[PDB]
Design a binder for this molecule. Structure first.
Ligand SMILES: Cc1nc2ccc(Cl)cc2nc1C
Ligand SMILES: [Mg+2]
Ligand SMILES: [Zn+2]
Length: 313
């Protein structure tokens, strides 16, 4: 009950900042997550024995892929931690509990292939789940791990609180399907501008939590340039593997996934910052003013990609 996790001084200070990198020491990431749960939620939210057994089972069910791995899971949870810590009073006890777990679980059992590749391969998961294929799977795997003996970190919730938290986690994980982000942000944009945005309206909270999930999921574009640049290699290593597998099914991949068109990457990143990342952090900054550092860092990285194109690096 009185057992805190304490980090070294540099981590203790930097973990509060949006641009924190969890570092290359895998064995510290579980402790970093528990630390964040304790300060975000409380030391009483979860039985430590049960939380630790849940964390290690989640870790085991992330695969050894270049990007959609255990490090991505903990990175996305840290961004959620930073958003929640800078917006103390806007979120309920259940929401703080639910969203850190949703973030840690959001890409469970990812193989490093898009929903598109599953559909064109005719993967069984594509028959079981026609839309948000991987994301329905990630939610499935999360429930499976929650129902392992000793792994039910929510067992102290009432019946109805339990149903609410699993429903927060399901919507949170489904929302990480980027195909759903475009319409969600358009709607949040209209609502904020016409002044109809109302955070006591559950359907409006759902939408805002969805955008928070997109913002955390993309948070590698909000790091210091050397982290963003090196993470971009990992993301493109999966894209190029998927492009190779498209070619094996006799389909020319989109240029983003074609390893023969590496030269077009800087311009592809521009498109992605302008069409996805900047709009995402703009609308988020409009709804939650203290998340502005994510937008500032994202713009800095847009500028760095412009410099790559202009041959200045
Ligand atoms: C979709 C997408 N997601 C990303 C997430 C993180 C980083 Cl560094 C780069 C990314 N590039 C693209 C194209
Ligand atoms: Mg995902
Ligand atoms: Zn993800």
């Amino acid at each position: 009950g009185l057992m805190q996790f304490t980090l070294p001084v540099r981590l203790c200070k930097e973990i509060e900042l949006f641009h924190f990198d969890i570092g290359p020491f895998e064995n510290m990431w579980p402790g970093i997550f528990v630390y964040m749960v304790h300060r975000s939620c409380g030391t009483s939210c979860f039985e430590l024995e049960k939380l630790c057994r849940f964390i290690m089972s989640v870790k085991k069910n992330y695969r050894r892929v270049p990007y959609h791995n255990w490090k991505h899971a903990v990175t996305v949870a840290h961004c959620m931690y930073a958003i929640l810590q800078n917006n103390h009073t806007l979120f309920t006890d259940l929401e703080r509990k639910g969203l850190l777990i949703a973030c840690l679980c959001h890409d469970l059992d990812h193989r490093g292939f898009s929903n598109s590749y599953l559909q064109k391969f005719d993967h069984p998961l594509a028959a079981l789940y026609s839309t948000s294929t991987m994301e329905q799977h990630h939610f499935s795997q999360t429930v499976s791990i929650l129902q392992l003996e000793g792994h039910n970190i929510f067992s102290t919730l009432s019946s109805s609180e339990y149903e609410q938290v699993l429903e927060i986690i399901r919507k949170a994980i489904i929302a990480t399907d980027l195909a759903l982000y475009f319409g969600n942000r358009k709607q949040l944009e209209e609502m904020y501008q016409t002044g109809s945005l109302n955070l006591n309206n559950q359907s409006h909270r759902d939408r805002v939590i969805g955008l928070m999930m997109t913002a955390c999921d993309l948070c590698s574009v909000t790091k210091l340039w050397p982290v963003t640049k090196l993470t971009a290699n990992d993301i493109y290593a999966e894209f190029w593997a998927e492009g190779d597998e498209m070619k094996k099914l006799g389909i020319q991949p989109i240029p983003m996934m074609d390893r023969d068109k590496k030269d077009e990457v800087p311009q592809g990143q521009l498109g992605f910052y302008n069409a996805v990342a900047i709009p995402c952090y703009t609308t988020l900054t409009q709804i939650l003013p203290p998340t502005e550092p994510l937008l500032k860092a994202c713009r800095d990285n847009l500028s760095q990609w412009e410099k790559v194109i202009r041959g200045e690096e």
